[PDB]
Amino acid sequence: KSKKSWQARHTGIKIVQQIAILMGCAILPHLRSLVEIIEHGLVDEQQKVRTISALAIAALAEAATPYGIESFDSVLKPLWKGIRQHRGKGLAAFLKAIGYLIPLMDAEYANYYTREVMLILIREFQSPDEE
Amino acid sequence: VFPFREELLAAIANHQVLIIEGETGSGKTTQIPQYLFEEGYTNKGMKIACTQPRRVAAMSVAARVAREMGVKLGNEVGYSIRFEDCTSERTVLRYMTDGMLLREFLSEPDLASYSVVMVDEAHERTLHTDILFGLIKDVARFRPELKVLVASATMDTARFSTFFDDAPVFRIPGRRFPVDIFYTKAPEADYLEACVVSVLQIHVTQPPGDILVFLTGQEEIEAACEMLQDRCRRLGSKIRELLVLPIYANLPSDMQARIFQPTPPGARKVVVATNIAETSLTIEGIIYVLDPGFCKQKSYNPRTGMESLTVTPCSKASANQRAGRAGRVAAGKCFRLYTAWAYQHELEETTVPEIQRTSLGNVVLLLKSLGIHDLMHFDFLDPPPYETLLLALEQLYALGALNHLGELTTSGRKMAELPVDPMLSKMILASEKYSCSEEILTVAAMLSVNNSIFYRPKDKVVHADNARVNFFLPGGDHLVLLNVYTQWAESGYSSQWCYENFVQFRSMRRARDVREQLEGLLERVEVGLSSCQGDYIRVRKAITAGYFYHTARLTRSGYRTVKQQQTVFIHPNSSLFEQQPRWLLYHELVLTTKEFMRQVLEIESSWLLEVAPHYYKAKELEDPH
Amino acid sequence: NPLTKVKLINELNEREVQLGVADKVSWHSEYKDSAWIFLGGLPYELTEGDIICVFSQYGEIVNINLVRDKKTGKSKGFCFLCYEDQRSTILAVDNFNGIKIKGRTIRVDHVSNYRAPKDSEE
């Protein structure tokens, strides 16, 4: 949460990402106090910071499996805004984050997030990049 | 009408109730109420009421009659409209909407203030007029002093005379000049462009005479005014000047008066009007009519149990009325945007009375306030289905407006004091308990106006939504209304501010007036004005207290409504930004292609249970979807 | 991320030369009937003539397409080149990948469908 250069915030969100992919489920009792950081991102003016914040949300969702769905509730709305208005690698990182969050979720909300995202998947089957 | 004046006087003198029929423009509204001569209402300490289904007809006619009488408007001649009164102790003759007279009935069942009541434009058969006819029939028994006149454009007398216990009829012979009719070769899918082209052609080619174009609504009319005005200027050098004027229900009085203004010479006037122009009033000098064949009509669906206003094709009778407007001065022309076949075969002969078309909740509360116990038995000219009435009583009961007995509660009696739908009145009345009354007051006023609040041009959408976003409150469309109203309160260069903001000044101004009138009601009634700091919960609760019947729950996919278990989607106007809003309260049900729910605000389910436990009991709920 | 696809397309050809894949199934029978190639990471000082001079070694580009912006810009970094023959595109994606021209390295990929104003990844 320092604002002099985006490299420090990029570094800290990268720390969150490699913590989440390094240690599996012991990050879960400290999940909420770690995820309350991450919503200060995703609205920044840098594409790299938003992309690595989506990767950190995706890494925390992969680490949780399937716990803490009421703790990511402040994250789904900027992800929905980003898959509506933004396209590119940010769309891919947002789609990774949402696709990792939706197995954690109850049936009605995950079904609503599943049925209104497959159009984006059919649209992005024409993508040339391998990642 | 003047050639008949003696004949009319004789009928009036002889009978308590009379029916008077004549084509529009014959002079029914303006001249007849001049019954003041025979009546001498003022000496008796009474007035005469003339009721109009349309606000514009009441306001404009009153202004005209005041001039005809050589008195000041608001004085001897005045008008009464819902949030707009222009009357005084001096008022002799009061033109008013039927809704208003019904409200006066609620306070005084006898309507002792009036010696004569004239229900005009009966042919429209609005709900308010239908109730008024029922009530008057009985009041007449009570007061031999009261005289009633029913006026209608339709030459058809019989149904009314019989309803009136074989009241006598006076008919005025039709003066209308012949009007030639033009039809289109083929059906036209997009009528507005076609309407614009026809207007321009008439102005260039045709000899002097004004044009009357019939459109559907304000937004469409406003669009046509700009396009026609621009094109007219383009005609410019070659063609004479063409003035263009809008007319619709909302227009302020000063603007309504503009339609009367004379055309420049060789220049022409075009009035772009809703159906107000059909029978309600006449603009002298119209020779040419353009009839697209559409109107905004209320529709009711009994299975779904919902009203909705849709644009639909006009009845044959209304098509004839529109053409007739061309004939008043001299031989005219009417351009019908459809084929002769459609006119003969397709158009339904006549529209149904509004009573058949409506949700009855407002009417039931009104009748109860009237002191009518037997709702089923009420002598309607055309009785509504019993089921619609039963549903209305049940809804009022859950609202707590009526008890299980069907008697008014303190809340029902107070709600009757407010000129709004019961859900809105209840929401407003409860708000002080919520400590939100000031915010609710603004929301209710904002709800009472068109969604002309936000303007989105089709091409212009991006900028317009960017402007809206400033006000927008996530998961709370009702809150957005509060934000925009509050901002509208403080904005330098108000007219320009609205335009830059993509907001309709007309709607916001109307909302401002309504809020002022409602606040006065709250002051009189002793409903304290309350507010808190940053309490969204209290606002959502207050909305729930009124709206708990109109709630939808987030389905596994889509939304389902608590009442009638209907599948619906949140209207595209709002984004369910928050995933959290599982439960939403919605203002309206729109039925374009699919079923949509408009103007939604999130609500906690526990609040619904807490707020309306009778409604929220599981026993009434069907097997769990 | 902006230039690791250079390493990816290089490791594809290294895996092809390691496993001993014949030319019938070596990734170019799937992109037939298309002479269009996409470029990535071009500097902003490149005109169309310099791009023609640097990629005309294996055949002249029949159809050039630089991403020239509407009013306020000059270039973005992408390019479309349509050669004569598809084997020229094979040799261009196998040989012109990994090189650098004035600082930033460039990448060559296939298109195979149709030209687009902006769909790719900057």
Closest CA to B382 of B406, B351, B348, B410: B351
Identity of the residue numbered B565: Q
The CA distance from B586 to B621, in Å, is: 19
The CA distance from B509 to B518, in Å, is: 14
Name every chain A residue with its beta carbon within 8 A of the beta carbon of C113.
126
Beta strand pairing call for B559-561 and B567-570: antiparallel
> Which residues in chain B (579-608) have CB-CB distances under 8 A to chain A?
579-580, 582
Backbone angles phi, psi at B552, to 5 degrees: -130, 145
| Method used to solve the structure | cryo-EM
Q: Which residues of A touch B (CB under 8 A)?
A: 73, 76-77, 80-81, 84, 107-109, 111-113, 115-116
CB B48 within 8 A of CB B92: yes
The residue to which tokens 């339709």 are assigned: B154
Our measurement of the distance from residue A15's CA atom to the centroid of its chain's CA atoms, rounded to an integer in Å, reads 15
CA atoms within 13 A of residue B503's CA, in its CB half-sphere: 30
How many angstroms separate the first and last alpha carbons of chain B? 64
Beta strand pairing call for C36-40 and C79-82: antiparallel
What chains are in contact with B, requiring at least 3 Cβ pairs below 8 Å? A
CATH 3.30.70.330 for domain C2-122: yes
Query: Angle, nearest 10°, between helix axes B410-417 and B422-434?
Result: 110
Question: Which of B556, B578, B580 lies nearest to residue A112, judging by beta carbons?
Answer: B556
Size of interface A-C (CB pairs under 8 A): 20
Name every chain B residue with its beta carbon within 8 A of the beta carbon of A109.
554, 579, 582
Beta strand pairing call for B332-336 and B179-182: parallel
Residues contacting B189, CB < 8 A, separation 6+: none
Substitution target from A80, A106, A116, A119 for chain B, most B beta carbons within 10 A: A80
> Does any CB of chain A come closer than 8 Å to the CB of residue B572?
no
- Tell me the structure's resolution in angstroms, rounded to a single decimal: 4.5
CB B314 within 8 A of CB B293: yes
Q: DSSP class of residue B469?
A: H
CB C46 within 8 A of CB C88: no
Our measurement of the distance from residue B439's CA atom to the centroid of its chain's CA atoms, rounded to an integer in Å, reads 25
Name every chain C residue with its beta carbon within 8 A of the beta carbon of A131.
1, 5
* Distance in Å, alpha carbon of A33 to nearest chain B alpha carbon: 20
CB-based contact A111 B474, cutoff 8 Å? no
Beta bridge partners of B97: B52
Closest CA to B248 of B506, B571, B441: B506
Which H or E run contains C80? strand C79-82
Name every chain A residue with its beta carbon within 8 A of the beta carbon of B575.
80, 84
How many Cβ atoms sit within 10 Å of the Cβ of residue C76? 15
Backbone angles phi, psi at B157, to 5 degrees: -100, -40
The CA distance from B603 to B355, in Å, is: 33
What chains are in contact with C, requiring at least 3 Cβ pairs below 8 Å? A
CB-based contact A81 B580, cutoff 8 Å? no
Nearest chain A alpha carbon to C4:
A131
Query: Angle, nearest 10°, between helix axes B386-399 and B422-434?
Result: 10
Chains A and C touch (3+ CB pairs under 8 A): yes
Strand arrangement of the beta sheet that strand C107-110 belongs to: C63-66, C79-82, C36-40, C107-110
CB B95 within 8 A of CB B50: yes
CB-based contact B555 A80, cutoff 8 Å? no
- Tell me how far CA of residue A4 lies from CA of A7, A8, A9, B584, C55, in angstroms: 9, 8, 9, 41, 43
How many Cβ atoms sit within 10 Å of the Cβ of residue C15? 10
CB-based contact B577 A80, cutoff 8 Å? yes
Q: DSSP class of residue B4?
A: G
CB B581 within 8 A of CB B475: yes
Nearest chain B alpha carbon to A116:
B557
Q: DSSP class of residue B176?
A: P
CB-based contact A126 C109, cutoff 8 Å? no
* Distance in Å, alpha carbon of A130 to nearest chain B alpha carbon: 31
Question: Which of B557, B575, B579 lies nearest to residue A115, judging by beta carbons?
Answer: B557
Beta bridge partners of B169: B19
Chains C and B touch (3+ CB pairs under 8 A): no
How many angstroms separate the first and last alpha carbons of chain C? 10
Nearest chain B alpha carbon to A108:
B556
Closest CA to B584 of B547, B614, B545, B534: B547
Q: DSSP class of residue B549?
A: T
Which H or E run contains B322? helix B316-324
- Tell me how far CA of residue B531 lies from CA of B362, B441, B484, B535, B538, in angstroms: 29, 11, 18, 9, 10
Question: Which of A77, A108, A113 lies nearest to residue B578, judging by beta carbons?
Answer: A77
The residue to which tokens 């000098």 are assigned: B285
The CA distance from A63 to A66, in Å, is: 9
Residue B175, both tokens: 């003066």
The CA distance from B472 to B487, in Å, is: 12
Nearest chain A alpha carbon to C121:
A88
Question: Which of A89, A127, A130 lies nearest to residue C8, judging by beta carbons?
Answer: A130
Name every chain C residue with its beta carbon within 8 A of the beta carbon of A129.
5, 120-121
Beta strand pairing call for B583-591 and B147-152: unpaired
The CA distance from B368 to B361, in Å, is: 11
DSSP B385-447: PHHHHHHHHHHHHHHTSB-TTS-B-HHHHHHHHSSS-HHHHHHHHHHHHHT-HHHHHHHHHHH
The CA distance from B390 to B398, in Å, is: 13
Question: Which of B554, B578, B580 lies nearest to residue A112, judging by beta carbons?
Answer: B554
Closest CA to A13 of A46, A79, A24: A46
The CA distance from B417 to B428, in Å, is: 12
**Where does B25-126 have alpha helices with state H?**
28-31, 36-39, 41-44, 55-69, 98-107
The CA distance from B428 to B449, in Å, is: 16
Buried-state track C25-64, b at ≥16 Cβ within 10 A, e below 16: ebbbeebeeebbbbbbbbeeebeeeebeeebeebbebeee
Strand arrangement of the beta sheet that strand B169-171 belongs to: B84-86, B77-81, B93-97, B47-52, B114-119, B147-152, B17-21, B169-171
Backbone angles phi, psi at C86, to 5 degrees: -75, -25
Question: Which of A126, A127, A130 lies nearest to residue C5, judging by beta carbons?
Answer: A130
Name every chain C residue with its beta carbon within 8 A of the beta carbon of A10.
none
Size of interface A-B (CB pairs under 8 A): 31
CB B597 within 8 A of CB B559: yes
Residues contacting B97, CB < 8 A, separation 6+: B51, B52, B53, B54, B55, B58, B80, B81, B82, B128
> Does any CB of chain A come closer than 8 Å to the CB of residue B466?
no
Our measurement of the distance from residue A40's CA atom to the centroid of its chain's CA atoms, rounded to an integer in Å, reads 13
Burial of B104 (0-12, 13-18, 19+ CB in 10 A): middle
Q: List the domain boundaries for chain C.
A: 2-122
The CA distance from C42 to B12, in Å, is: 94
Annotated binding site for ATP: which residue ranges of B? Answer: 22-29
Burial of B272 (0-12, 13-18, 19+ CB in 10 A): buried
Buried-state track B524-548, b at ≥16 Cβ within 10 A, e below 16: eeebeebeeeeeeebbbbbbbbbbb
The residue to which tokens 């071009």 are assigned: C42
> Does any CB of chain A come closer than 8 Å to the CB of residue B556?
yes
Name every chain A residue with its beta carbon within 8 A of the beta carbon of C111.
128
CB-based contact A112 B558, cutoff 8 Å? yes
The CA distance from B68 to B73, in Å, is: 11
Identity of the residue numbered B368: K
Residue B192, both tokens: 């507005």
Beta bridge partners of B333: B180, B288
Beta strand pairing call for C79-82 and C63-66: antiparallel
Substitution target from A108, A115, A118 for chain B, most B beta carbons within 10 A: A108
3-state secondary structure of B128: helix
Name every chain A residue with its beta carbon within 8 A of the beta carbon of B552.
none
Chains A and B touch (3+ CB pairs under 8 A): yes
Q: DSSP class of residue B80?
A: E
CB-based contact C1 A89, cutoff 8 Å? yes
Name every chain B residue with its beta carbon within 8 A of the beta carbon of A80.
575, 577, 579
Angle in degrees, CA B325, B329, B330, rounded to 5: 100
How many Cβ atoms sit within 10 Å of the Cβ of residue A32? 12
